Design a protein around this ligand. Sequence first.
Ligand SMILES: *Cc1c(COP(=O)(O)O)cnc(C)c1O
Ligand SMILES: *Cc1c(COP(=O)(O)O)cnc(C)c1O
Lengths: 385, 385
Amino acid sequence: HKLLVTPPKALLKPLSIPNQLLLGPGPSNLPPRIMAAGGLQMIGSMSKDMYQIMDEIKEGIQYVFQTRNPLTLVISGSGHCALEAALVNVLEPGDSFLVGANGIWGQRAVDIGERIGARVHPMTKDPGGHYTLQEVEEGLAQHKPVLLFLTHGESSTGVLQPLDGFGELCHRYKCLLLVDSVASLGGTPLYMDRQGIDILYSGSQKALNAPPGTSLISFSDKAKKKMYSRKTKPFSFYLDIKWLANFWGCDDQPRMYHHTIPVISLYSLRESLALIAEQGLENSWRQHREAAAYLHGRLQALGLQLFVKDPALRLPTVTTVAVPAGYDWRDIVSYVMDHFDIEIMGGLGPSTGKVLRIGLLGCNATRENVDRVTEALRAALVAQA
Amino acid sequence: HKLLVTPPKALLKPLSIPNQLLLGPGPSNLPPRIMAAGGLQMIGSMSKDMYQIMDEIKEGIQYVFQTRNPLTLVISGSGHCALEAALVNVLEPGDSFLVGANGIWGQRAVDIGERIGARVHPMTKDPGGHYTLQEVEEGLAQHKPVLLFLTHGESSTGVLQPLDGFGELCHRYKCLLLVDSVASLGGTPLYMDRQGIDILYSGSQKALNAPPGTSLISFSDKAKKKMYSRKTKPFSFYLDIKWLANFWGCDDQPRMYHHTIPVISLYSLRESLALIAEQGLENSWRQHREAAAYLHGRLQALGLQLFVKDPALRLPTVTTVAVPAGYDWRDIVSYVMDHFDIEIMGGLGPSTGKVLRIGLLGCNATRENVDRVTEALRAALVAQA
Ligand SMILES: *Cc1c(COP(=O)(O)O)cnc(C)c1O
Ligand SMILES: *Cc1c(COP(=O)(O)O)cnc(C)c1O
């Protein structure tokens, strides 16, 4: 008859959150305008006003990606979900899939690729490494892939992968180019159409300063053709691009219900795109470049060594710092939080144990935050020694 | 250096949202506590405080589902995503999958099951219908399925599916029972462990009144055994239950990074679970029961016919009304919004073109809202006559 479970006592207490200055690889703190959007009332998930907001967002993604691609929309899930959406739609079982495995993101692309039946060909590199035109051309020639995955901003290694020329190279081998720009978008130069990128995705919670939970994606016509001529439906319904394209107003059919979009998250994402449209892409790139240069100079002043030696290969948004020999990286991370309420991170995937990671993301990429994190790091290094 | 795309003027003006009373089948309006939570600052997505909030949310789901299942968590996606996560983990290609296709939710389960290689066996019924024990047992004996899908609250048809005895019946046939309670949860009686349900899922944006974008799921040990003994990996990484289980603290291993959870959406979901824990499940059921009964009487007074004839079979949270002959249902929906700022909906799937749908969800299930939607309908009806 009765009730097994009683009302949880923890839930009868008010929600409270600590104040944390998030200076790791993401998510980032939210500016007032984004927080305000997140506190708004609901509207209809298929209403004319919702559709107008979705249209503005689409124009915003096209601006930040620098693309005129009609097939451009928001994925209702985190950065992983956008990657998975690209892969389950583009790749059919048996398809040759070339992957830049130079950190955790390439490792994740390999995993998803394998799960959906692709024949995966990793080009494996030690963390800190990047791919040359010559290396990719070799992979293209040897493996004849339908798709190449490359990470633009390798947030696990602090590496900025050059993108010029890779798209045209892929196209000469009849291969599509997929680029992960979750950590790079808004913080470094990126020009989707100019660079011949076929699939580009990013996430909301990095330099955009929106809450985590949504991601951005765009597909060239070459990519669309592959996704719309499959012999088999994608393994996913939730991420089926034909349904999503339709609902996001990317085709000539009336929008049909697919899934309920995250209405409130889209308010916030809209405002994040408004903030960078107001700032200007190039102005944002300059902000991050300068903030990163300031950070690097101060880190080296403390006698720390940047994990990526070539300044031209350093990702401005996420800086990897080699962990000083004899020092405990966990205790540095703990000290920084316990005494300054600042979050930084260690490594991720192959960079685990090797590095500290410091993020400079959007409105949080400031000289003041650089001073705050370097003051924290200094105190942690001293208490240790 | 030539930017293809200039900043979108649409984003260079303020975000504009209308004030709408949402009395369709969801999403519903947000109460003040839930809006307030949505406006908070970020914390670290893998911080101890975030983990504590996740633990409290988990206790909340165990309360609303009435289960002690350790494998209970939030899916980082809408209601569709929770359904897909259940199917992609439980079903291997070749598995027999029996489906109660008596509305759009069963049809969606067929679609997903087909995509992931299951041998799908629909028990098809006209909209308005529900399954008896005998019908299900007949399907079980015939198709010997590993899994049965049943919709609890059929929100496309207004039907409340009986659940007593179905779990016990499935287990006798060595079949797992999966139940969609997106529309029913919090609105009508439901007891996961007591009713022998193996997989139960719901959504954030129906009776809970949280923003759409997250969903709730729980798995019995029997369901766990299947997911953890399959010889093939699920087609999805983003929805892989072994990774999600671990990050959500359901394992005996330390939490490993999988994907970034939607931190802000979780503040809101936590608060929505807190509101219903304070009210009490039985009180919530009573509230919905009463509002619905009051709604049914006022609809019939206008000369309107309830689509579901048997009151015992009516879903309190979503009421289907037959479109009255002579009238344009589209114009009724439009009139109600244009003049009264209220959203109602037409049909969905097999009920498309046949019904109007009126939702009474959580704190919005009130006599006041019934009066408002009924006055709006009355004006709409008179206007067309
Ligand atoms: C709304 C609903 C769903 C789907 O939820 P989404 O969040 O729109 O994906 C599934 N089942 C039922 C019964 C629903 O009412
Ligand atoms: C953070 C990140 C991801 C994954 O994002 P999630 O939101 O955690 O799923 C993928 N790629 C890069 C480069 C990232 O920085």
